[PDB]
């Protein structure tokens, strides 16, 4: 009964919207955090079928429930668009190399 299951990680829609709110504000503020500068453009190399419109931005969602603030990003991400609409929750867990797969 996870709202989203990323490997052995379990996220609720509430966890996802809390992560999305912090990431979108950073986006809107035109700021970033961490060595890899999150949030940033998510191009959809995977060709996932997102229902919302481009552009997409990837922001880390942490299994610890704390909001990402610059450290190790982990394998899971929340992808939201320019309008602050959730596109999907994805993960490196189960995918090869740097690819992603959608969290069920």
Swiss-Prot record:
Class of the enzyme per the UniProt entry, highest EC level: lyase
The keyword Cytoplasm is assigned to this record: no
Keyword Signal: yes
Underlying gene: rntA
Swiss-Prot/TrEMBL keywords: Disulfide bond, Endonuclease, Hydrolase, Lyase, Nuclease, Signal
One annotated Gene Ontology cellular component of this protein: hyphal tip
Active site: 40, 58 (proton acceptor), 92 (proton donor)
Disulfide bonds: 2-10, 6-103
Parent-protein start and end of this portion: 27 to 130 of 130
Family the UniProt entry places it in: Belongs to the ribonuclease N1/T1 family.
Name this protein carries in UniProt: Guanyl-specific ribonuclease T1
E.C. numbers: 4.6.1.24
GO molecular function: lyase activity; ribonuclease T1 activity; RNA binding; RNA endonuclease activity
Assembly, per entry: Monomer.
Top-level taxon of the source organism: Eukaryota
Catalytic activity: [RNA] containing guanosine + H2O = an [RNA fragment]-3'-guanosine-3'-phosphate + a 5'-hydroxy-ribonucleotide-3'-[RNA fragment]
